Amino acid sequence: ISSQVYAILVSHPPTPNDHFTPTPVSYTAGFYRIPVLGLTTRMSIYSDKSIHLSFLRTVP
Amino acid sequence: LNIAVMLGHSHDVTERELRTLWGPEQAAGLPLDVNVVALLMNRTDPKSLITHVCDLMSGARIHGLVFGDDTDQEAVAQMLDFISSHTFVPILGIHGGASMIMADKDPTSTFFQFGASIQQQATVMLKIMQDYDWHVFSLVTTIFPGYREFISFVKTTVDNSFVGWDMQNVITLDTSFEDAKTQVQLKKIHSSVILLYCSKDEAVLILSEARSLGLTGYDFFWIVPSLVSGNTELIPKEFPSGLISVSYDDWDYSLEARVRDGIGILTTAASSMLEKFSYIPEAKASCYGQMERPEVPMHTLHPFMVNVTWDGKDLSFTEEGYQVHPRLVVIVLNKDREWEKVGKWENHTLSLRHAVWPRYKSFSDCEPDDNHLSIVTLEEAPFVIVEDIDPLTETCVRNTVPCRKFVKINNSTNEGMNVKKCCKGFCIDILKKLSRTVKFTYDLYLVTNGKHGKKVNNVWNGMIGEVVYQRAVMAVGSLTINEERSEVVDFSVPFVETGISVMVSRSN
Amino acid sequence: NVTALLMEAKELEARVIILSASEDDAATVYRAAAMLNMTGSGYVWLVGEREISGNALRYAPDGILGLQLINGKNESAHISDAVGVVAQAVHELLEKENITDPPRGCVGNTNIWKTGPLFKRVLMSSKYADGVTGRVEFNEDGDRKFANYSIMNLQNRKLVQVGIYNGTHVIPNDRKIIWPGGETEKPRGYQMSTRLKIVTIHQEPFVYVKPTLSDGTCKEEFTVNGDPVKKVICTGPNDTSPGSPRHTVPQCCYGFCIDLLIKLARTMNFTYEVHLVADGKFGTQERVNNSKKEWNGMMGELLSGQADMIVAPLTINNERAQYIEFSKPFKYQGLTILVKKEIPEERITGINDPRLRNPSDKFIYATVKQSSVDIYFRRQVELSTMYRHMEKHNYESAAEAIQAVRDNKLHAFIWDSAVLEFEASQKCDLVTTGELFFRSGFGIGMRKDSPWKQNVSLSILKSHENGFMEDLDKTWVRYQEC
């Protein structure tokens, strides 16, 4: 955020932990309503624009 | 048992020792180490918030933190859960931004708000609907998060109730302020009570659009959820004078009381946990440090949070994570563009503060209320028969009309509890038939002093005294036509004939 | 331990499982179904994508069907597609009127970048079919729509993919898709399992109930033409008095509904598990204690998956008809009143009589607390005083009702016309005052799913057309006069 980004990308780490990273980045960038994109995280809670504000992913 | 409290820095930004001096002689018993390490807040940012909490955590073995933010950044609540996600330190917020509910939290963390859920607000709404005999409504919803739960709940409750609601069409504005289907949707509303649910700006826009369509007037009752009731001093120009929206208590339940209650809750929970077994919970090593692994032998104080009392207060946070007995008070806009307060909600009762709803001026530029007649009657045998509301679905029987009345408790005491009861008979049937064909509303009440009418000392008592004083139009009841009565007050043409009769019969 | 769930699932008709959960839970359920021999014939199985990956793929039985997204654990393709979409959206937005800058620094400035919500709104809808994943178009909820899956079918620990789902367009592939066990067919789902049970209630000549004789069989009786009477042994309760030590001792079961049931059984070749109803009610639904509409008695048991068919006196009511499939009416009886015949007085013309319209203290009438009479009365809100009197003097059955009206404890009795006529034909002490109204043809209702509704309807229609019921009426009820 120190470089005034416009849309962050997010992807799973090499070692799996189901949720891991999308939750922190989603919350933090959702403070300022900066839309983010998912790339692999296909788990169902995220598709709820009331606990995650702004989150668009690219896998059903 | 050292805990910390972050204040709001706005209302009571002074005397940190005053907060630190809670329960000076004896707060709740002070079992082992009841001490406050409360700090001060400021403009909150996720970096600053995380930094302050992590710094404090690597301090004097901090315990459950009470949060009292004053600003409304909405998402802040979520952030709080995140901290409780990855540091097993229970946390609860009371006032401000960490007050609006968030619903499903992570089952591996503890964080309990103190606001009102959607379901409780909807239930109080339907209760305020049924307590005034308004069993017809049509609701319009925008596309905003949470509409699915609201619609599903309102659909589930209506058909599981025996009140007999006439719930009409629901409306969902697919496109906002486009008037393609929104305009015709708004037009096809034949009811009088509308349960709008939307965002503040969306609600303002919708009300502004609908005002010019005539959907507002002396009989047009909007009710909106607490979300629409936002700032207490930002009433817009599109808000009609008089509308009902439930909200959390703000005029009462001062901040100090909430803080003291929360500290007492935490102390009692810690005492119960210690009494269960003597194994104190150790704080986390360092949030800023290395990675963390699950090492708690059992849930330290999560199960020790439900079923807790404190000097009458019965706060009993549910498994979802909110209070089961919220202090909800329904408010209504006054005639001076200020929020009034009417009716609390203590155990389950509405405890409303108006026997009859006052017809409020919808606007300074609106048609006058020229279709309401305050009819009156007198209790006779064959004309009107009074009764009381039955306990089952306590509104009234589905075969008559509610007639308010004045009852004096005992004789010496002039306790005028205007009881709500419903009555039938003969004249009321004709009144209903007439009102159907002449489309006028009525809030009728029984006569108080005397019966029938008489020119006693040149002043009339009964229904005649009411009409002769321009206090109540219409006096429907068993009234006999008389020349003096006709001279004083006008009559209409008769419908049922009668006269003087002699009641003498045969003994055998 | 999930043995209970599998055990409960075993005794069921449908033969299709849709397991969808975590990998370890899938392994546990696989072990359970292996132990309980659930993986046998006619058990086509469907499984979620995760449940055939990792440690789960070592214990699953041969025969399952699995599905999976094609471009899955890949990142280069997804990165390329996402960058394309984001660039397209930014270039589209930047030609607007009032655009701010992203908030520099995450300490301090703590406001809402309004162009952020605008950006999300515009980015929500932007088709871009120029990337190696397929055309990409986000849906309304904020996800990815129009993907394609591959349906791999397990075959001797060799995942062989067949068919492709390209969106509402499932197109198969040439391969003999084995089913668990090695069979080559389209197995089967629903199963008949003709051990369906009858639950009934004792009343009228329709049902004849008495304690069974200790010889194992009730008795060896006959009829007018010396024909032995068919009987069964139901196992209903014998504790009609509250507080008794209920034992459900079997009793005699030799009514008329048993004759109909036996005729239908010889029409359909099935078995039964007859037993009476504990409480006993036509289904007068009520409200639970300080909490949704609650049914009761025979109807409540029937809806609660207990009774399969409910052949009994079942006067058709819209309260029952909301969720039930009635069969063809096998009876035509109305609602009629009955009073004790005097040893000048006028016959009361039912509710049409104004005297019966206005209750009086000397006119104490009551039918029952549990029947369709009360539920019909509640529907027609015109005579609430009579309904209140009926409720405040309600009885619990018809035997004590007729006993009470025998000694003038009550003053009237409204019931089915046939029941009253039969009662007054044998013990001709009372009369048959009143007319018939609310004529409801007795039906046979079922749950919304049943493979016998059409069959029972056609069978009862054929029996009515050939007059088989008339012979039973002659030989069972209309046989005496005084």
Side-chain angles (χ1 to χ4, degrees), chain B residues 75-103 105-142 144-148 150-165 168-173 175-176 179-180 182-184 186-189 191-197 199-200 203-208 210-218 220-230 232 234 236 239-249 251-255 257:
Chain B
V76 152
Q78 291 188 356
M79 191 65 38
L80 261 171
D81 194 325
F82 185 37
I83 294 185
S84 156
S85 90
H86 289 140
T87 312
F88 306 141
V89 277
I91 182 143
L92 58 68
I94 47 185
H95 178 275
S99 68
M100 38 196 56
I101 198 54
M102 155 187 129
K105 336 173 199 303
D106 219 13
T108 165
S109 36
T110 53
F111 162 78
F112 318 119
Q113 288 117 323
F114 210 179
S117 89
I118 277 286
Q119 279 57 27
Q120 279 147 304
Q121 287 150 144
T123 289
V124 161
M125 257 153 217
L126 290 205
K127 275 320 182 325
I128 215 184
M129 217 69 91
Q130 69 96 356
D131 209 80
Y132 268 174
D133 222 354
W134 296 348
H135 318 176
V136 47
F137 47 76
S138 35
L139 57 93
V140 50
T141 80
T142 195
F144 188 87
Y147 54 56
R148 280 294 137 268
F150 198 47
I151 291 307
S152 43
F153 179 86
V154 82
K155 170 64 167 308
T156 294
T157 325
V158 51
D159 43 18
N160 253 9
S161 35
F162 261 126
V163 155
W165 318 95
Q168 273 189 17
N169 66 88
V170 308
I171 305 192
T172 322
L173 307 188
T175 320
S176 35
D179 286 39
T182 85
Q183 197 31 256
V184 54
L186 293 151
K187 225 145 162 169
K188 53 208 205 205
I189 306 180
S191 184
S192 75
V193 163
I194 289 93
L195 269 184
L196 162 69
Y197 152 72
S199 84
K200 176 98 78 63
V204 160
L205 180 64
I206 284 318
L207 281 202
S208 100
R211 161 157 207 285
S212 322
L213 210 78
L215 264 284
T216 174
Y218 255 112
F220 268 125
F221 292 161
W222 307 82
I223 291 154
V224 285
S226 75
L227 183 131
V228 180
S229 93
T232 83
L234 256 299
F239 261 61
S241 157
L243 87 170
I244 294 98
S245 96
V246 58
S247 87
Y248 196 31
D249 175 25
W251 279 245
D252 272 322
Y253 196 28
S254 147
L255 186 136

Side-chain angles (χ1 to χ4, degrees), chain A residues 1 4 11 32 47 57-58, chain C residues 75 104-106 138 143-144:
Chain A
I1 318 286
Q4 60 154 48
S11 160
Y32 302 78
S47 298
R57 76 226 279 193
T58 40
Chain C
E75 285 203 295
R104 321 194 69 258
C106 55
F138 303 94
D143 268 354
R144 156 73 161 288

